[PDB]
Design an enzyme around this catalytic site. Structure first.
Site, mmCIF file in Angstrom:
data_model
loop_
_atom_site.group_PDB
_atom_site.id
_atom_site.type_symbol
_atom_site.label_atom_id
_atom_site.label_comp_id
_atom_site.label_asym_id
_atom_site.label_seq_id
_atom_site.Cartn_x
_atom_site.Cartn_y
_atom_site.Cartn_z
ATOM 1 N N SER A 45 38.064 -10.144 -21.427
ATOM 2 C CA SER A 45 37.877 -10.976 -20.237
ATOM 3 C C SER A 45 39.017 -10.890 -19.246
ATOM 4 O O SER A 45 38.878 -11.471 -18.162
ATOM 5 C CB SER A 45 37.633 -12.438 -20.645
ATOM 6 N N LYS A 48 37.995 -10.011 -15.719
ATOM 7 C CA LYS A 48 37.427 -10.960 -14.756
ATOM 8 C C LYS A 48 38.316 -11.138 -13.540
ATOM 9 O O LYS A 48 37.820 -11.477 -12.456
ATOM 10 C CB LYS A 48 37.146 -12.289 -15.456
ATOM 11 N N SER A 105 36.377 -18.731 -18.599
ATOM 12 C CA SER A 105 35.960 -17.452 -19.159
ATOM 13 C C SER A 105 34.446 -17.405 -19.362
ATOM 14 O O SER A 105 33.947 -16.849 -20.334
ATOM 15 C CB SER A 105 36.717 -17.108 -20.444
ATOM 16 N N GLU A 141 28.847 -8.134 -19.452
ATOM 17 C CA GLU A 141 28.928 -9.053 -20.567
ATOM 18 C C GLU A 141 27.626 -9.132 -21.348
ATOM 19 O O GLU A 141 26.554 -9.174 -20.725
ATOM 20 C CB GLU A 141 29.273 -10.471 -20.084
ATOM 21 N N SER A 212 39.509 -11.940 -25.171
ATOM 22 C CA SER A 212 39.299 -11.830 -26.602
ATOM 23 C C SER A 212 38.059 -10.973 -26.830
ATOM 24 O O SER A 212 37.159 -10.955 -25.984
ATOM 25 C CB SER A 212 39.121 -13.196 -27.256
HETATM 26 O O1 LIG Z 1 23.424 -12.560 -14.511
HETATM 27 C C1 LIG Z 1 22.412 -11.597 -14.354
HETATM 28 C C2 LIG Z 1 22.911 -10.333 -13.680
HETATM 29 O O2 LIG Z 1 23.890 -9.684 -14.518
HETATM 30 C C3 LIG Z 1 23.610 -8.310 -14.642
HETATM 31 C C4 LIG Z 1 24.908 -7.538 -14.731
HETATM 32 O O3 LIG Z 1 25.701 -7.843 -13.589
HETATM 33 O O4 LIG Z 1 22.814 -8.112 -15.858
HETATM 34 C C5 LIG Z 1 23.288 -8.720 -17.077
HETATM 35 O O5 LIG Z 1 22.462 -9.883 -17.417
HETATM 36 C C6 LIG Z 1 21.055 -9.606 -17.553
HETATM 37 C C7 LIG Z 1 20.301 -10.863 -17.839
HETATM 38 O O6 LIG Z 1 20.975 -11.711 -18.771
HETATM 39 C C8 LIG Z 1 20.807 -8.504 -18.571
HETATM 40 O O7 LIG Z 1 19.398 -8.116 -18.489
HETATM 41 C C9 LIG Z 1 21.634 -7.296 -18.291
HETATM 42 O O8 LIG Z 1 21.497 -6.296 -19.287
HETATM 43 C C10 LIG Z 1 23.114 -7.718 -18.226
HETATM 44 O O9 LIG Z 1 23.987 -6.611 -18.015
HETATM 45 C C11 LIG Z 1 22.688 -7.995 -13.438
HETATM 46 O O10 LIG Z 1 21.863 -6.857 -13.603
HETATM 47 C C12 LIG Z 1 21.896 -9.272 -13.261
HETATM 48 O O11 LIG Z 1 21.461 -9.374 -11.907
#
Ligand SMILES: OC[C@H]1O[C@@](CO)(O[C@H]2O[C@H](CO)[C@@H](O)[C@H](O)[C@H]2O)[C@@H](O)[C@@H]1O
Length: 263
Positions: A45, A48, A105, A141, A212
């Site tokens: 993290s 970030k 975080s 993440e 972490s």
């Molecule tokens: O928060 C959703 C947003 O995050 C992204 C990565 O920036 O996708 C992440 O979250 C999705 C839904 O939980 C997952 O389907 C995806 O694999 C994960 O990386 C964006 O694509 C999305 O708009």
């Protein structure tokens, strides 16, 4: 060759059973103290900070960007969502997401920052634009925290991250308003009490971001204002040989205590 400070860090590392990376910049005289300063470590993290900074950079030309609401749906949530879960079927602004990512975080918040930047590659592109040649963000993440031995994904070096954190928080990689906002967010972190902060005098002001991950990866990056002298940046990265190793925030505190003696 090695200094007493580096010897103490090597002994700490040996006792800990892991791999420790440290970088100190003292802005009084721009001196650097490094331990494994050019080896790659998994960021977890601590990455970030780079994502929040990248959005701050965008806001230098788009003045209301930080106040742009972003929708949060059930499907957005990942493995650790302390703030975002309170906003499902609602919104968070990019400032709210930045604060959640940095200060709690929150991993959903981080994924919304990454999306704002066009993907992990947009975070890396920002790093390169400010002169960080080493940082790479490859994944979202939660998978960026796997911290697999030898994997270059989602890594940086202590020297590179200390230099970048200096430029972001004390230098001019960001506009003055944006630098101040980043400092405000880092100062209010809620997750750092057992890490670098625990090894530094209480009277000092500290902004930090922890990390972490797998392999007992335990990280902290900090901007520090000692009483009566110029500010410092300190990076402490730690990772361990076995996948289910425990966290060792105490190692980071001990590293900070060792570095503070030689100031
Ligand atoms: O928060 C959703 C947003 O995050 C992204 C990565 O920036 O996708 C992440 O979250 C999705 C839904 O939980 C997952 O389907 C995806 O694999 C994960 O990386 C964006 O694509 C999305 O708009």
């Amino acid at each position: 060759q090695t200094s007493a400070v580096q010897q103490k860090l090597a002994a700490l590392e040996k006792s800990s059973g892991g791999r420790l990376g440290v970088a100190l910049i003292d802005t009084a005289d721009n001196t650097q103290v490094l331990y494994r300063g050019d080896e790659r470590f998994p960021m977890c993290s601590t990455s970030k900070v780079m994502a929040a900074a990248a959005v701050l950079k965008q806001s230098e030309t788009q003045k209301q960007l930080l106040n742009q609401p972003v929708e949060i749906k059930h499907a957005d949530l990942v493995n650790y969502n302390p703030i975002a879960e309170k906003h499902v079927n609602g919104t968070m602004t990019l400032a709210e997401l930045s604060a959640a990512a940095l200060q709690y975080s929150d991993n959903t918040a981080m994924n919304k920052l990454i999306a704002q930047l066009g993907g992990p590659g947009g975070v890396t592109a920002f790093a390169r634009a400010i002169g960080d040649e080493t940082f790479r963000l490859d994944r979202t993440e939660p998978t960026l925290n796997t911290a697999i031995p030898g994997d270059p994904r989602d890594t940086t070096t202590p020297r590179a991250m200390a230099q970048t954190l200096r430029q972001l928080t004390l230098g001019h990689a960001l506009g003055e308003t944006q630098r101040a906002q980043l400092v405000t967010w880092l100062k209010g972190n809620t997750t750092g009490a057992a890490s670098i902060r625990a090894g530094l005098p209480t009277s000092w002001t500290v902004g930090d971001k922890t990390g972490s991950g797998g392999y007992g990866t335990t990280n902290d990056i900090a901007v520090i204002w000692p009483q009566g002298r110029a500010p410092l940046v300190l990076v402490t990265y730690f990772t361990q040989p076995q996948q289910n190793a425990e966290s060792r925030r105490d190692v980071l505190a001990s590293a900070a205590r060792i570095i503070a003696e030689g100031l």
